[PDB]
């Protein structure tokens, strides 16, 4: 597993300022995160935005305080000291784990001088950055790193995520049943003969390593209230590991018929950015869907593992652009010549060309969707790359 | 009568949006957002205040070609820099072209929550008084506004009074030339006129200010996109400033004639998909150069006043309610007994009852749509509102 990092810090300090900057749809619209993938530093690494959650702590960034690999405890150098700063410090000085004491807004300063006050944190070496320029960000990072040191599986390893109430005990049990789950982090079964994994691990930074360690994630739903913030930002982060997908919308029994198509539109609607991915209508308690379920695990799975032969992927790709030719440039014509696979699991086509610097987004819709039905792609979120 | 605009000038990272938000927030924040996602806003309705005015954000354009335009159209500008940080270079040469303004400008030293030694330092930019304040926590905030204000001081038209509003280039100055130039229609910011005896109102490069200004000064706006491209951020954000206003609408497809017909149902799908909030409006689909589909606006410009016009006696409220009710129960179950209108442009309906705390999203849509189709409330944006 590859660490978690916290950020921890009064209001105002820089957090999500510092967590976009180190993780860097539909119009108008920004997707909200308070969790993603770490992109700066040479590892890979989860970073949680405690401010996301919520003068005393949070119940979630307290626990976030157990159970990340590391904090950085966020602090205002511009300011001074606020005594809010000096309760948060007594609570993480107590931390088994590492806990990086970040002096924030420190651009074109005096690094030593802004860390004067903080060395009565008792916290350590105050490490001077700026969140908003980068001044001393990867540094800071790469020193984080320094602790933790850095194959498919011929069959699908998949993880049960999802809000807390939604059925995952409940249909992780109807999956594997009392035998079976009394032997449990990985549990190998088998159905009709074919080979299976669950992962067994509300815990963002779980369900964050679920993720990680699956190659299908089964994301549930409670099909009897709205689908929420929680929801989508679990589905989101699964949507940025490039995942693959099947979504189980259950408790399917509880809904009447006249409410079906109006659940159904609402899901749609709310969950668009799931459109690569099959949904299935179960009820884990009556035990109903879940065929169906593994049936789309499977497809998922491969998917994701597919190789493409690159005349396979040209020919696909010269029959759609020859059906509808790509948006013209204001003025110039851009020219779709080949393709090929730049990436597995999820796979990425790369199509090379001339002029292919402004692309609409729904030319690009339109690919997407001609090779997911050429290869059968449903359940991988499949990502067109244009070389420039 | 025009209200006031004033404009938020800064440096990145000085705390325009914070400031922004403080300024234009809503304690029921009426935006029809998904779960996961924001609305991102740069402009909107001024809320702190004794009187009305306009807030630009200039923060969303990234000094900048918009930006300066602003500068010159506001009504006044506040300056915000960082009291914490100190006096940057750049702070510096934004002075040397505010200095300049023929109105009002406004230095807002920011984040002081040591008002005396923030405002030596600024003096230096020679732009008048300093304002200490705390865009985040509010510290001075209220009187800067009021200060502001203290220079401007503080009936439905019979008929619909419309506004072509839409980002640059979709075809507004040609589909205004089309509208006074088409078969039925008979001939200082409105121009007045007929078709088939009743009468209307027209009101007459790219200026957010303008738009605003458009908005207001209308009862029924129609918005105008340009169908041979992709739905842009810009395009919502003026349709979202609209709907914020509770303004009546129609849309107006634009560039119709470009679009081939396989390409037509991709195109129709793309629009309803990212202007979702606008289902509450109908949609035309219309080649302004071409001078077709122009004759349907009139009737849907009427029915969208008629609509945002509407007084719904309390019974037919109430009976719609019940009916509602009756037929589809609320998903502890709420008890919802009677209604009746609390708002005009756009109508209100207010819903009496117990339990009515937590309605659903989906449910609230259900009433919404029941209350559009027996009323016949397309085009003004119809919301319901339960006293708990
Ligand atoms: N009607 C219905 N209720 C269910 C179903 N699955 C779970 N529930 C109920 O949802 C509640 C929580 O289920 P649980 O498996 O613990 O959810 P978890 O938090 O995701 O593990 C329990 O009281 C279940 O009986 C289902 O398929 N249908
Ligand atoms: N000067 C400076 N300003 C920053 C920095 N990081 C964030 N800000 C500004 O701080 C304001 C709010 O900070 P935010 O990131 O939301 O703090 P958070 O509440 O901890 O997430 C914004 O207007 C930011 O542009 C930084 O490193 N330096
Ligand atoms: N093909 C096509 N072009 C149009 C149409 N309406 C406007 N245009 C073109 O769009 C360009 C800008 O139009 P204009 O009315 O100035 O857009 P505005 O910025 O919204 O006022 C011009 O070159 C027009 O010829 C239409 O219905 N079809
Ligand atoms: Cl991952
Ligand atoms: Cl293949
Ligand atoms: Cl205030």
Redesign the pocket.
Known sequence: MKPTIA?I????????????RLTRDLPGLTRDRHYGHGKVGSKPYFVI?T?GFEHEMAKQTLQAVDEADAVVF?VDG?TGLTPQDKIIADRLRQSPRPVYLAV????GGDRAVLAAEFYELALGEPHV?????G?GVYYLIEEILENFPEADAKHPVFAVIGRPNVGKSTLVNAILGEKRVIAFIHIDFEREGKPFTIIDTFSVIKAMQAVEAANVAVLVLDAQQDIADQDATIAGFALEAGRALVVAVNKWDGISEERREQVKRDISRKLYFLDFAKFHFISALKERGIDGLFESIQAAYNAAMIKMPTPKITRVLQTAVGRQQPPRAGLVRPKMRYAHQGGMNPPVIVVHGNSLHAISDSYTRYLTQTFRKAFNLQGTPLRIQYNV
């Open positions: 950020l810090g009064r209001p105002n300090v820089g957090k999500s300022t510092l967590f976009n935005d401010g966020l511009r924030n807004k420190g651009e950055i700026s969140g908003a320029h001044d």
